[PDB]
Design a protein around this ligand. Structure first.
Ligand SMILES: O=C(Cc1ccccc1)Nc1ccc(OC2CCN(c3ccc(NC(=O)Cc4ccccc4)nn3)CC2)nn1
Ligand SMILES: O=C(Cc1ccccc1)Nc1ccc(OC2CCN(c3ccc(NC(=O)Cc4ccccc4)nn3)CC2)nn1
Lengths: 410, 409, 410, 410
């Protein structure tokens, strides 16, 4: 027997030469992208076989074997429908309808409190999917960068817990929602911020990461970390957003000074610098595509699905998902957890980083916010998404009424 | 080919008659109990053959077909190791270790406010498991009756959502935790109680069930419902607990009048009557075994796992799970969601109704409570359980470090 | 010399027979009424000389002396302008302007939550004065009975402190305002109600009065007490108001059960019976005239000004004045204390029991209540009054700008 | 007749020359000090008579006329026992007893949060009286400087109202106590600090005074203002306290930024500069003697009692008294208003600026603070004072049980 030969016969279809475009089309049908880093040896070898000839361009079993040998494990599970979403082409047409249905919710106000969130057009709308297996799909404005803002809060929390542990991190930050009563209070009863997802909590978490080095290396290290989280897809920085966030962060300076007075920072913290680092971390830029890979890493137990690298420890991902569940959508967190039941995190730029554990990661983006700070189209999409699929954290995998389950084929 | 014959040969062992004590043993190893109602026809005929030919005791291949005939589907997935927990015998050895480690946590105080909770011994400790497929295991005092107390709140909420729908029910009760800053406040910003898991919310929920009949029919309507959730195992009533709760419920009488003044009940509500109904639902009794089937029904999308009956709509079960996750353990709820990450519900009798979605339901019971009202041993068990198995809501099924996965081989 | 004849010469005209109508008209100018209980022997004697032989309304120096003998001390300070308000006739003319200008504040809604207060016309508006010296003046509907409702709370608080002492009473009730929006929190940090002026505090206070006898004797004791406080003017009971307060007091029953569970009552308290006593105390009836004497006792250190009796201990009156200052006007207490600076207490029937310490007590009554529960006309009047006179608690008696001081002469 | 001649005979003692040492003793017994600025012409002339005529220290009627001529009015009310406290020598014996009674309360902790309050000895203890007529008495450490700290908050508020009016000032700051559940909150329901006596309210009030000039001119404008309140007695500045107060004020910097974000300052406010001004106003130094004249100015309707100057408008003084009544002693204000019933204001240095309206001003000073921030000895003295005299806001001036009234004779 031989696995490269088996794969060849199921794609060759009784024929005895496979055109290269027919293998690439079959490959995209799985949902993988030709630029998937795990396929680079096979793509490199197709580029090198495509130097021998403009004439022919077809692959027999040993030229097919010559190329796919290196990636045969990953290619066969794609072609034997063993990915988390077997009929991925069906699923993306459901993603497309959902996207078109939110695209009609043109309500909401674009954030204007700094001129950089204000440049953004209110009709921009993108959705990007990445599954725990690296199947990819985008629809809308998924390759235009925008700032993470508070979507960076779960990421730096994950980094902090990954490096220092749950017990150290939560000496300085709570792990509960504050209650739809104390959005205005900075501290709880043990004089810690309520959770890493609020501004007081995020600011303390920022003070914990890579202590003892300067802000340039702290920022470089986090940029490093989000690079592995996004499988090296687009991660950037908006100094324009950075400069406006700092000439307007009077609430954040208030929080910083309060926390300094309540001794909420580690010993030896230069608070005003932490606020500068914090403003930098919220001006980091992503696209829907690159952010959905960050989301997919959290959906995949800490392994980036398009590279296979272990990026976060399982304790760090669990905590971050646990706190995205309950504190992730500002004053909407309770309603979102009840009706949508997915770990999610909103930001004022209009992104909603969304995680379906064991299935997929996503980044929705539309700048118009609702009265609570969450993207109107984004919020609409997540209700529709869970209304269509048994993706709700407490849906049942066996008895789920008339909803659809993309993890299965029949 | 044929399914009874294959199953025969995989148990027949190359040999050509199967002793029934060996068939009964292979069966119990899967985790089913021979008294599973889904198995009653196969058991009834095994008893009839042990009568019709009392000479002999062994089963040839066509007498085997005569017995496993109508339950062959369930028997095959039991014997082909296809239940949610394939190696049930190993897993119960883990449950036993977990129980013995929680059994040495002797802290906590038994509830004193009525002499019925105080007469319970502090050495009582039991955990009962029931899977989404009906595999059962017990350890400790799992056949001792006790009242559900607030463990009844997620059930009556589920009954309410099942009968009237999410939107109607939550016209009268919120869907969030209050914030552990407001056990003291009864109402949220829209003058509804914060959620069904606090006393004020349960009292409003109690007022929604079976409107228009008297308390005797409402109670029996709830009783029919809880019988079905537990596959007809023990569901009872303590009038002793009921009478003491009503002569000491000055706080719930306080809540009732407040809700009446703030107009939180549906029109035409007899507030004091609802309060009497509420004290009754909190005096309903279960054992660990019978309640664990109720928990397993919630883990099973609303189908009772030992009968196959649809008891609750999936909307009802999902809502109830979401609110047990966040509001189920009084002031320990946030910590419980973070560290244990399981839908659970505490009661003052010392029970913790616990649900691992898609796997199993459980009921742990130990009367000594901690400072927050949660059973000391029960809480210790739930931390151990999640530290051992990847059952945490946001554990990963593919990458889970040093944890054990009982769903895997 | 002689004090009765000196008095005679001061009314005597330079002439030396005084007509009896001239003495009585000169008497009323003082602000005293001929039916003042301290004047009864002098009136009894005028009733008897007015028998003599009806010829000549005149009193010679020996017949005048025969009548004014027994009350000569009180009559001499009345006629030698030694009362707290010397020119009382001028002062009532300002009361009349203040009354007529408030009479045009037609805003507000009559309480209708029971049909007995809803029965009252918004037409009704009365003001009654009684000074620390027994000078009386009314304007408007001052002889119509209405219920005290929460205006009774300072009075039963005074009775409690008079009988048991400050220390015992305040084991069960706080002595501060709650903070203006804690009206439905029932207890403070020490699990006592915030003060006697809120429903929870009043309910605890009711449980403290005359412990150990039944509600009929408890009520008879408070009624006798309010009789001595009003110099035996009208005090009654509206059973109509009583039954509607009790078949509608769901908030008061909620409060009672809450207090029972938190063990806020003295040992051996029958909770639902106390609530019945409390509903009775709020159904006690007064008129403006009768109630202004009760207020005047409070302005007078606990001595009723029209009888001379010690009715309340000074400790009881001081505390009651202290808490009417801060807690007397519901959510208006802070604004009322700041701008008006007088101890006052409102009730839902439209009353405002008002005390000017060392000067006079008042009862304003107009049923239409404002958005906060206080009588519109009454509130308008209390501002005008303090805007006209240096009666504000922190006005200065020596340097007081544009304001008038009715205690001075020229 | 003639007023200089009358006064001579009541002192002339039956003789026809008054020894000057005897006139000075008769004067001091009234409670005036010979250096009273209102007495300067009489003292300058006695000193000059003591130079021109060494030949016998005796004063006849024509030379006694020569000295008391210019200050004749004030001298007569001093000697004809018309000052607010006629038997001033008796009363000071009561102040001394009260002082020695609190001197035995050696509990409490001296504030150490900056090294300047930490070096004050714990049994420094002084009380200084100044009446509405300028009668003075001190006992203990009454001439040692200390900073006002929050004792400056009522003075700046009075200056703000004096210059800008009630309506303007209270556009930016409330006028009620917060409630012993909102001591931690910075803002009320209308996004203003609760009252001028808490730090957020003091900080906004500081931002209102003398807008448009720099901090040097602002500072001199307030000092010049506090100089008149103290009859030009010692008002100074501790730069040491100022430098340590600005390097420890992260809580007030927290307050500043929060108020900036919630826009609680006038337009064009330099917040960080206002904070510097705020740190200066609390480092202003006084003694018990000089501060008690400031208190006496508020007790005297805005006139400094030892000079005759109008320093504050009556509206300014009334408001400031109303808000020290209810908001002046941190979390102790309600208990203090209830039991002591006097306008007072506490500071972390151990001062309590105390005002008995229409009678006298006081400053008590003892550095050891109790749990709530109030000077242990100061608070004990203030209870003692009101248990001894009927100065309580709602004591009665006519019926006051066994208490003493220093306004009366015997
Ligand atoms: O341990 C605790 C808390 C706690 C909770 C539970 C048990 C015990 C202890 N520390 C703690 C936390 C937060 C906090 O607050 C600070 C101060 C400023 N800051 C404001 C400041 C004004 C406001 N103002 C309003 O809410 C106005 C308003 C009031 C009422 C109705 C409507 C509006 N909000 N936040 C936010 C930070 N202080 N201390
Ligand atoms: O010693 C304490 C606490 C304490 C002490 C020391 C240190 C920390 C704590 N006592 C105490 C007193 C009263 C009290 O409350 C009771 C029960 C419910 N009860 C409601 C219930 C809901 C409402 N409604 C709302 O809150 C809605 C709302 C919420 C927010 C903003 C706007 C509206 N009102 N009253 C009336 C009375 N609990 N505990």
């Amino acid at each position: 027997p031989s696995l490269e030969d088996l794969l060849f016969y199921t794609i060759a279809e009784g024929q005895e030469k496979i055109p290269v475009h027919k293998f690439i089309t079959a490959l995209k049908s799985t949902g993988l992208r030709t630029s998937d880093p795990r396929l680079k040896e096979c793509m490199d070898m197709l580029r090198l076989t495509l130097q021998t000839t403009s004439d022919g361009v077809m692959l027999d079993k040993d030229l097919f074997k010559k190329c796919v040998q290196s990636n045969i494990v990953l290619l066969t599970q794609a072609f034997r429908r063993k990915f988390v979403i077997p009929d991925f082409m069906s699923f993306t047409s459901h993603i497309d309808e959902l996207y078109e249905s939110a695209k009609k919710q043109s309500g909401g106000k674009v954030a204007d409190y700094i001129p950089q969130l204000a440049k953004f057009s209110p009709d921009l709308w993108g959705v990007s999917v990445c599954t725990a297996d690296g199947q990819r799909h985008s629809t809308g404005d998924t390759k235009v960068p925008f700032c993470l803002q508070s979507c960076v809060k779960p990421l730096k929390y994950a980094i902090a817990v990954n490096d220092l542990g749950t017990e150290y991190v939560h000496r300085y930050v709570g792990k509960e929602p504050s209650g739809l009563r104390f959005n205005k209070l900075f501290l709880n009863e043990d004089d810690k911020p309520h959770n890493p997802m609020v501004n007081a909590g995020a600011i303390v978490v920022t003070s914990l990461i890579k202590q003892g080095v300067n802000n340039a290396e702290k920022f470089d290290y986090v940029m490093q970390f989000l690079n592995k989280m996004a499988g090296n897809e687009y991660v950037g920085f908006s100094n324009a957003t950075f400069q406006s966030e700092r000439e307007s962060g009077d609430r954040n300076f208030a929080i910083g000074y309060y926390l300094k007075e309540k001794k909420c920072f580690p010993e030896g913290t230069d608070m005003v610098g932490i606020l500068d680092f914090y403003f930098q971390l919220c001006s980091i830029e992503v696209t829907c595509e690159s952010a959905s890979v960050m989301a997919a890493t959290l959906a995949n137990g800490g392994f980036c699905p398009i590279t296979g690298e272990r990026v976060l420890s399982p304790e760090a991902v669990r905590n971050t998902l646990s706190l995205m569940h309950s504190c992730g959508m500002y004053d909407f967190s309770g309603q979102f957890a009840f009706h949508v039941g997915l770990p999610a995190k909103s930001g004022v730029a209009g992104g909603i980083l969304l995680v379906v554990p064991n299935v997929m990661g996503m980044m929705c983006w539309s700048p118009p916010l609702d009265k609570m700070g969450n993207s109107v189209k984004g919020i609409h999409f997540c209700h529709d998404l869970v209304s269509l699929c048994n993706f709700h954290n407490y849906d049942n995998l066996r008895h789920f009424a008339k909803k659809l389950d993309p993890r299965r084929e029949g």
